């Protein structure tokens, strides 16, 4: 699964309700979501989400 792939390259997305989503960079960003971080490693993206989704 791309969301569990430690060899992946990742973005962090947020919606208008301030919820966050990990995202593989190869995939198109869905409507209603905007990129706030990345491209970056999986661990750094999760670090960002744990930092900002507060």
């Amino acid at each position: 699964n791309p969301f569990d792939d430690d060899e992946g390259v990742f973005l962090v997305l947020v919606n208008d309700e301030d919820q966050y989503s990990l995202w593989p960079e190869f995939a198109e960003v869905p409507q209603g979501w905007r990129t706030v971080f990345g491209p970056t490693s999986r661990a750094a993206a999760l670090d960002y989400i744990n930092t900002h989704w507060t």
């Binding site: 699964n1 208008d16 990990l22 989400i49």
Partner: protein
């Protein structure tokens, strides 16, 4: 109100009989409290198909769709 999706590793829907992963749409979680934000962001991901800003529940389960559109379970990844 849940929608069943059978996606490949590129998050594309799959045709009848193809083996993919089950994702659930129409998911709603608590809005006031997110004690595990990273895990939540990796398990409930942006939804390419539903309304803008919606999320899919990444089950981690292998399934395939039958001719009548119903889903057959094949085991956890």
């Amino acid at each position: 109100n849940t929608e069943l999706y059978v996606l490949d590793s590129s998050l594309r829907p799959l045709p009848t009989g193809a083996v993919g992963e089950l994702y659930l749409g129409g998911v709603q979680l608590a809005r006031g409290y997110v004690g595990r934000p990273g895990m939540t962001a990796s398990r409930f991901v942006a939804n390419p198909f539903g309304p803008p800003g919606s999320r899919l529940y990444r089950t981690g389960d292998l399934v395939r769709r039958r001719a009548d559109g119903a889903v057959e379970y094949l085991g956890r990844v």
